[PDB]
Scaffold this active site. Structure first.
Site, PDB file in Angstrom:
ATOM      1  N   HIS A  46       0.794  -1.233   0.000  1.00 23.66           N
ATOM      2  CA  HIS A  46       0.000   0.000   0.000  1.00 23.66           C
ATOM      3  C   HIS A  46       0.825   1.280   0.000  1.00 23.66           C
ATOM      4  O   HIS A  46       0.325   2.345  -0.358  1.00 23.66           O
ATOM      5  CB  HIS A  46      -1.066   0.002   1.122  1.00 23.66           C
ATOM      6  CG  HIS A  46      -0.594   0.533   2.446  1.00 23.66           C
ATOM      7  ND1 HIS A  46      -0.398  -0.278   3.542  1.00 23.66           N
ATOM      8  CD2 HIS A  46      -0.359   1.797   2.871  1.00 23.66           C
ATOM      9  CE1 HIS A  46      -0.065   0.462   4.584  1.00 23.66           C
ATOM     10  NE2 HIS A  46      -0.035   1.725   4.203  1.00 23.66           N
ATOM     11  N   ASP A  97      -0.788  -7.182   2.080  1.00 21.43           N
ATOM     12  CA  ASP A  97      -0.046  -5.935   2.162  1.00 21.43           C
ATOM     13  C   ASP A  97       1.419  -6.207   2.456  1.00 21.43           C
ATOM     14  O   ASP A  97       1.895  -6.031   3.582  1.00 21.43           O
ATOM     15  CB  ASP A  97      -0.668  -5.052   3.236  1.00 21.43           C
ATOM     16  CG  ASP A  97      -0.336  -3.594   3.056  1.00 21.43           C
ATOM     17  OD1 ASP A  97       0.294  -3.228   2.042  1.00 21.43           O
ATOM     18  OD2 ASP A  97      -0.716  -2.805   3.943  1.00 21.43           O
ATOM     19  N   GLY A 196       2.229   6.803   8.984  1.00 22.94           N
ATOM     20  CA  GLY A 196       3.641   7.138   8.926  1.00 22.94           C
ATOM     21  C   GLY A 196       4.494   5.960   9.376  1.00 22.94           C
ATOM     22  O   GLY A 196       5.698   5.943   9.129  1.00 22.94           O
ATOM     23  N   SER A 198       3.598   2.641   8.593  1.00 22.43           N
ATOM     24  CA  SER A 198       3.386   1.509   7.699  1.00 22.43           C
ATOM     25  C   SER A 198       4.642   0.988   7.034  1.00 22.43           C
ATOM     26  O   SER A 198       5.574   1.737   6.765  1.00 22.43           O
ATOM     27  CB  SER A 198       2.345   1.849   6.641  1.00 22.43           C
ATOM     28  OG  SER A 198       1.086   2.008   7.255  1.00 22.43           O
TER      29      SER A 198
HETATM   30  C1  LIG Z   1       0.355   3.287   7.414  1.00 27.33           C
HETATM   31  O1  LIG Z   1       0.307   3.638   6.222  1.00 27.33           O
HETATM   32  C2  LIG Z   1      -0.796   3.081   8.292  1.00 27.33           C
HETATM   33  C3  LIG Z   1      -0.460   2.388   9.629  1.00 27.33           C
HETATM   34  C4  LIG Z   1      -1.694   2.481  10.556  1.00 27.33           C
HETATM   35  C5  LIG Z   1      -1.517   1.617  11.826  1.00 27.33           C
HETATM   36  N1  LIG Z   1      -2.619   1.843  12.660  1.00 27.33           N
HETATM   37  C6  LIG Z   1      -2.711   1.290  13.871  1.00 27.33           C
HETATM   38  N2  LIG Z   1      -1.756   0.519  14.446  1.00 27.33           N
HETATM   39  N3  LIG Z   1      -3.838   1.508  14.568  1.00 27.33           N
HETATM   40  N4  LIG Z   1      -1.777   2.325   7.561  1.00 27.33           N
HETATM   41  C7  LIG Z   1      -2.787   2.939   6.982  1.00 27.33           C
HETATM   42  O2  LIG Z   1      -3.001   4.176   7.076  1.00 27.33           O
HETATM   43  C8  LIG Z   1      -3.727   2.146   6.178  1.00 27.33           C
HETATM   44  C9  LIG Z   1      -3.355   2.395   4.698  1.00 27.33           C
HETATM   45  N5  LIG Z   1      -5.058   2.588   6.373  1.00 27.33           N
HETATM   46  C10 LIG Z   1      -5.746   2.514   7.501  1.00 27.33           C
HETATM   47  O3  LIG Z   1      -5.207   2.054   8.520  1.00 27.33           O
HETATM   48  C11 LIG Z   1      -7.135   2.974   7.544  1.00 27.33           C
HETATM   49  C12 LIG Z   1      -8.140   1.901   7.052  1.00 27.33           C
HETATM   50  O4  LIG Z   1      -7.962   0.779   7.928  1.00 27.33           O
HETATM   51  N6  LIG Z   1      -7.479   3.326   8.875  1.00 27.33           N
HETATM   52  C13 LIG Z   1      -7.630   4.549   9.318  1.00 27.33           C
HETATM   53  O5  LIG Z   1      -7.957   4.717  10.503  1.00 27.33           O
HETATM   54  O6  LIG Z   1      -7.452   5.561   8.597  1.00 27.33           O
HETATM   55  C14 LIG Z   1      -8.069   6.759   8.562  1.00 27.33           C
HETATM   56  C15 LIG Z   1      -7.016   7.895   8.418  1.00 27.33           C
HETATM   57  C16 LIG Z   1      -6.645   8.346   9.860  1.00 27.33           C
HETATM   58  C17 LIG Z   1      -7.599   9.112   7.655  1.00 27.33           C
END
Ligand SMILES: *C(=O)[C@H](CCCNC(=N)N)NC(=O)[C@H](C)NC(=O)[C@@H](CO)NC(=O)OCC(C)C
Length: 247
Positions: A46, A97, A196, A198
């Site tokens: 992703h 992913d 940030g 991921s």
């Molecule tokens: C990295 O890119 C990120 C890591 C998130 C890890 N979160 C936790 N440990 N809680 N991942 C993402 O952003 C991923 C592409 N998307 C999401 O996680 C989305 C959909 O599940 N979730 C979300 O809360 O996003 C909304 C944002 C804050 C606008």
């Protein structure tokens, strides 16, 4: 990383920082990654799916700070960007992913091990730590959900592995989480990975050995009650990793 503590690359030598070059001179941070071999970095699909051009990426090893140099750091170009063909994103869940980046310096060489640059071991076929086990996550991601900027110093925290049974509960994620994913969270819901972070590593001490158990993938918000961070279950992707890292 919400909560946790600031750390040094010496304590997380396998951590790779991935940036993307833009039209002009602006270079922005994209995702974390892990050095699994001198020439290979593992991350999340992703992070690159929207811009699959290998030429726009830069990989840094031995780097403790986001926008400044760290003594001993090494810069790399991406020779081959391998994204998973079965990747897909639903409402919350991100499937398959996982991604591999073959790195090479301008001289055409791979990573040279040092005190700040080391490889992390992969798990064995379907051999994960027992649920309830403490693991660590590292990253340059958000310290708070309301932040729009990333911390300048690398951070790390400790979370615990949550069973598939508990994570699939209605108040958690239900059937959205699969067996190819791992849930981990702080029992007090105070610390967690966030945007940030991921692509980064979820490292667990497995039978006395530091192992790359997961890759930061997704979650509902950050550090929210009953909403664990979801990680790509590395042990279920060994065949895919092996088949793409040969030649
Ligand atoms: C990295 O890119 C990120 C890591 C998130 C890890 N979160 C936790 N440990 N809680 N991942 C993402 O952003 C991923 C592409 N998307 C999401 O996680 C989305 C959909 O599940 N979730 C979300 O809360 O996003 C909304 C944002 C804050 C606008």
């Amino acid at each position: 990383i919400i909560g946790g503590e600031f750390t040094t690359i010496e304590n997380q030598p396998w951590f790779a920082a991935i940036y993307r070059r833009h039209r002009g001179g602006s270079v922005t941070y994209v995702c974390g990654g892990s050095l699994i071999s001198p020439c290979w970095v593992i991350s999340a699909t992703h992070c690159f799916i929207d811009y699959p051009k290998k030429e726009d990426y830069i990989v840094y090893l031995g780097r403790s700070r986001l926008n400044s140099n760290t003594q001993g750091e090494m810069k790399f170009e991406v020779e081959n960007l391998i994204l998973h063909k079965d990747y897909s994103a639903d409402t919350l869940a991100h499937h398959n992913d996982i991604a591999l980046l073959k790195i090479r310096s301008k001289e055409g060489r791979c990573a040279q091990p040092s005190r700040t640059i080391q490889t992390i071991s992969l798990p064995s076929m379907y051999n994960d730590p027992q649920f309830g086990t403490s693991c660590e996550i590292t990253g340059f991601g958000k310290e708070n959900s309301t932040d729009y900027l990333y911390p300048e110093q690398l951070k790390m925290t400790v979370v615990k592995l949550i069973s598939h049974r508990e994570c699939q509960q209605p108040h958690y994620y239900g059937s959205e989480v699969t067996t190819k994913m791992l849930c981990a969270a702080d029992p007090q819901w105070k610390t967690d990975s966030c945007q940030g972070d991921s692509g980064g590593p979820l490292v667990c001490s497995l039978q006395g050995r530091m192992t790359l158990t997961g890759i930061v993938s997704w979650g509902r918000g950050c550090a929210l009650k009953d909403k664990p961070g979801v990680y790509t279950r590395v042990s279920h992707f060994l065949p895919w990793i092996r088949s793409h890292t040969k030649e």
